[PDB]
Amino acid sequence: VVDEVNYKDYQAVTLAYQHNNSGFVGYLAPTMRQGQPYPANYPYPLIGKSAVTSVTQKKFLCDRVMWRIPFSSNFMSMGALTDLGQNMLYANSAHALDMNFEVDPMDESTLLYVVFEVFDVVRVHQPHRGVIEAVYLRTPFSAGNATT
Amino acid sequence: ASISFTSINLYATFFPMAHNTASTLEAMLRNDTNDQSFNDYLSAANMLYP
Amino acid sequence: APTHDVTTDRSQRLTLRFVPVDREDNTYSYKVRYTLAVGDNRVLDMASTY
């Protein structure tokens, strides 16, 4: 896009004072044509002779993907029960976890969805006809860990 | 068209590996009979004739 | 998974970059020389260099 400081003929024209397809399209509305055939003045050239000085803007989109960071010393998991999940059977006693995050401003309220990846064991047994039993256990975050 | 190179660096990434196991590996790759060998995917003698 | 017996515990960077030790600029070419150093007990793969 145009470099608005190092282009010396940069005029900031608003939507109202932009024209392009003059005489062949409506005035700021999906309605019938209006105006006269006339030179445009809207986009600034970025190509060919008479191209304006420009800046570079770069970004990415990730849609349908949650960011994930494995809890493994090397950040690839070669087993579902991580190597640092098994250093918490000898060097654990409970620790605090504080996570800080920096996000872009949003003009509306947003939520952060943090998922703490665990084991959800749903385990079920029948010992007799018409009898069903179960025990449900999870490891780093679990229910029934401060009440019966 | 014109181009100029400003800044060139060489990135590298090491696997983090236990030092005991990566000196065992070193021992068995500094040896003569544990030589690495590669092929060129297309092995070619390039001869272009007018 | 392995019990941390396949990974370092004495602290080493994964990602590194080697700045040039010489650069030559010319009228049609550029030549960049680096020192690519591998610390003791580290394994470097030349697939991960760029």
């Binding site: 070669m78 | 196991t21 065992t24 092929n39 060129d40 995917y41 297309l42 092995s43 | 392995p2 396949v6």
Partner: peptide, 26 residues
Amino acid sequence: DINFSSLAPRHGTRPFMGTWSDIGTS
């Protein structure tokens, strides 16, 4: 074959008691 690719002294293995990767040499 027609263009080279013959390589690999590897199989891969995971010891039992689950699949537990690395035997760490035998």
